Amino acid sequence: MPRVVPDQRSKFENEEFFRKLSRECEIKYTGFRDRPHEERQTRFQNACRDGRSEIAFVATGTNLSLQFFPASWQGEQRQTPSREYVDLEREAGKVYLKAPMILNGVCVIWKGWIDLHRLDGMGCLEFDEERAQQEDALAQQ
């Protein structure tokens, strides 16, 4: 029972929420900051160390827990935060990340940056055309 639909991009491109979300729109923190927000700033930057953060989406007020790390890491058991997938450097004031997730029978990727002052930023969704193809290969051998 595969999860990839005939046209994964068809849904990621035609689906409404999937579309409005497939794009880029304001985002903010709404995970474990409900209590220690100002600290959450470090909890988030500290979570970026483990390639995992909890970001909220202003588009439709949807909570999202994503795991961002270099997918090209094989055997590297140790978890290291690289600006390749999880940035924590001053490349534009805030820090942006990229993580590959599984959305409605389609390979998706959420990318966005968080502001280290207000604890909010800009997020967006994207579809994976590199892995999407393999789904066909693996699903079809």
Nearest in space to 88 (alpha carbons), one of 48, 31, 38, 50: 48
The alpha carbon dihedral of 100, 95, 19, 26 has a sign of: positive
Name residue 111's beta-bridge partners.
98, 124
SS3 41: helix
Q: In sequence order, which residues have a C-beta less than 8 Å from that of residue 132 and are 6 or more positions away?
A: 4, 8, 9, 106, 107
Distance of alpha carbon 37 from alpha carbon 101, whole angstroms: 26
Residue 122 and residue 26 in contact, taking contact as beta carbons nearer than 8 Å: yes
Three-state SS at 56:
strand
Strand order in the sheet with 24-29: 62-67, 52-57, 24-29, 120-127, 106-114, 95-103
Residues 6+ apart with CB under 8 A from 116: 41, 45, 93, 94, 95
Structural domain that includes position 8: 1-141
**Calpha distance 74→130 (Å, rounded):** 17
Task: Say if strands 95-103 and 106-114 run parallel, antiparallel, or are unpaired.
Answer: antiparallel
Q: What is the CATH number of the domain that holds 2?
A: 2.40.250.10
Of 109, 105, 110, 100, the residue nearest 135 (C-alpha): 105
Query: Scanning the structure block, which residue is given the tokens 């988030």?
Result: 44
* Residue 37 main-chain phi, psi, to 5 deg: -60, -65
Residues 6+ apart with CB under 8 A from 6: none
Domains in the chain, number? 1
Distance between CA atoms of residues 95 and 119, nearest Å: 11
